Design a protein around this ligand. Structure first.
Ligand code: ANP
Ligand code: ANP
Ligand code: ZN
Ligand code: ZN
Lengths: 304, 304
């Protein structure tokens, strides 16, 4: 047998999955993420692998999804959310202990790869995963394989600046220029995310509603929320059309909180054509199938 | 033997190249591009293949580079530059006549694939080819393979709008907003290309010098040309840093006229870090190693 193991590392939990040669899930496990020592963090992962190995009588492949990246030169984890593993050579430590290769990828990449491997999307020459939550996260898939990038930065679409046409819609010099955690300004991370949705409402209407609350007022017909959504759908169209002119994805999968706003799936095909090239055609744009359980699938599939 | 044939279709000439299994170039030929009939155009290509087949005693693969695209649904060529072939199903017509598959790609993709297949760059997980000439052309390579995109639009980086930070450098509301052949405005096609270099000089200094002429005055120390280059290098840095945040290429290859301006290769490493993510690392940035054989090499390599 071939066996693919996947780990999704969260601040609170570690999710584990084993997948057979047909990508059928044959093991499922959730343990607390050790916040204490690094040795305990290692122990959690290593014990899960060795048990699965015994149970299935194989040496499964090992893929890991992390909220952050491994420094492409040192191997050191850059993950503010996992205190125990922050600054450790996780790949090297596990490869020594597990006597086999280990792949570690950002969760945005794992999300994308999970979606891209649905029976529906296999064969697609390219898939772009977008996560619209606290920030804008991206994962670029080409022929079923994660493009990680030179420094494991590929898909950081969130830290691209508002294009000219988006600035024009927001009023050029009068357009709000939001600060970014990357210390840059005008990043689309603070416009097209759930947080961005909120921030833009607050700027123009001087009130702090959460995204679900703005959406609720939209549904009731409130002038302000209707005006916001109209602005936002257009801004989303403009920004994505820019990214699509560069990337031309076959399929675009949306995840994270704001991906729940069903209006996006009807309004994007209507507003995109005006901003794409005349000869350009619309990608298939769907909501993510796997919600939160994608991380393990994606992690496992790093080794297909 | 395997043989790969490549064709680069120009308005005036059709170039042809044959490559052996080790990618050694074993034939080169050039015929006039028929401007008259489509049948004559077909004849030019078909005759070149049949002669090569006789000479090498094989049925070579056939890849073709075009200044434009084939409509991904109809197969019809969209190439204003080749009147005889404009609007014809070139792929299907040649497959019928040559009794084998035929691949047609934009020349910007062929350039990139030609560069990516250099001995140096084999094994590179990703390569971005950029052509800074009359316009900005891009070609996205992942593990030695062209990413064409959903409608063959992938890599049209030229028709992405100036990012916010580029607009800031050019003076926001006072920043010149150049029209674009795509009927959109603010496209970087009219800023970062050779033509763009000229257009930006002309805007700020009210004089029509060609790029080599501006470069010459830079070399002599002329106030105006020094001011232009400073602006341009920063604008180039800003724009590319945006694209790199999204794509994170391992290697970036520059082609086209402005790629001859050697100052680019020293000034880009110096100005990029300020505009990339703090954790981001610089791609290898080199001048094209295969000038004008790129169309034929890349065309042929579509079939590797
Ligand atoms: N059903 C929903 N509809 C609309 N917005 C939502 C919904 N659920 C959450 N959000 C918004 O999404 C944002 C947070 O997104 P969420 O994806 O839940 O973030 P997270 O838990 O930090 N994970 P991540 O996706 O990595 O950012 C907030 O701005 C919420 O208001
Ligand atoms: N050696 C050079 N140094 C600087 N600029 C140059 C040089 N050669 C050409 N250019 C400029 O590049 C532009 C034309 O680029 P060039 O690559 O020659 O165009 P093309 O062959 O007509 N089209 P393309 O190959 O698609 O870029 C003009 O602005 C020229 O001034
Ligand atoms: Zn940012
Ligand atoms: Zn354009």
């Amino acid at each position: 047998g071939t066996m693919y193991y996947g780990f999704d590392i969260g601040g609170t939990k570690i999710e584990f999955g084993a997948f057979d040669a047909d990508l059928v899930r044959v093991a499922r496990e959730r343990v607390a993420t050790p916040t204490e020592s690094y040795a305990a963090f290692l122990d959690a992962i290593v014990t899960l692998v060795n048990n699965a190995d015994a149970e299935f009588g194989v040496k499964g492949t090992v893929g890991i999804g992390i909220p952050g990246i491994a420094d492409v030169e040192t191997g050191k984890l850059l993950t503010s959310n996992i205190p125990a593993a922050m600054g450790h050579t996780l790949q090297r430590d596990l490869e020594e202990r597990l006597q086999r290769p280990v792949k570690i990828e950002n969760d945005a990449n794992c999300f994308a790869l999970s979606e891209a491997w649905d029976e529906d999307l296999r064969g697609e020459p390219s898939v772009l995963g977008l996560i619209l939550g606290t920030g804008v996260g991206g994962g670029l898939i080409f022929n079923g394989k994660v493009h990680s990038g030179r420094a494991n930065i590929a898909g950081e679409i969130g830290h691209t600046r508002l294009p000219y046409d988006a600035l024009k819609l927001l009023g050029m010099e009068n357009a709000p220029i939001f600060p970014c955690g990357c210390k840059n300004s005008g990043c689309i991370d603070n416009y097209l995310s759930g947080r961005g949705f909120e921030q833009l409402y607050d700027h123009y209407f001087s009130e702090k509603l959460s995204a679900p609350e703005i959406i609720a007022h939209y549904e009731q017909g409130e002038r302000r929320a209707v005006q916001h959504v109209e602005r936002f759908m257009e801004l989303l169209a403009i920004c994505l059309a820019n990214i699509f002119t560069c990337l031309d994805p076959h399929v675009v999968v949306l995840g994270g909180g704001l991906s729940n706003f069903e209006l996006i799936y009807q309004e994007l095909p209507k507003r995109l054509p005006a901003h794409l090239l005349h000869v350009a055609k619309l990608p298939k744009i769907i909501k993510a199938r796997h919600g939160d359980a994608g991380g393990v699938r994606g992690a496992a599939f790093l080794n297909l």
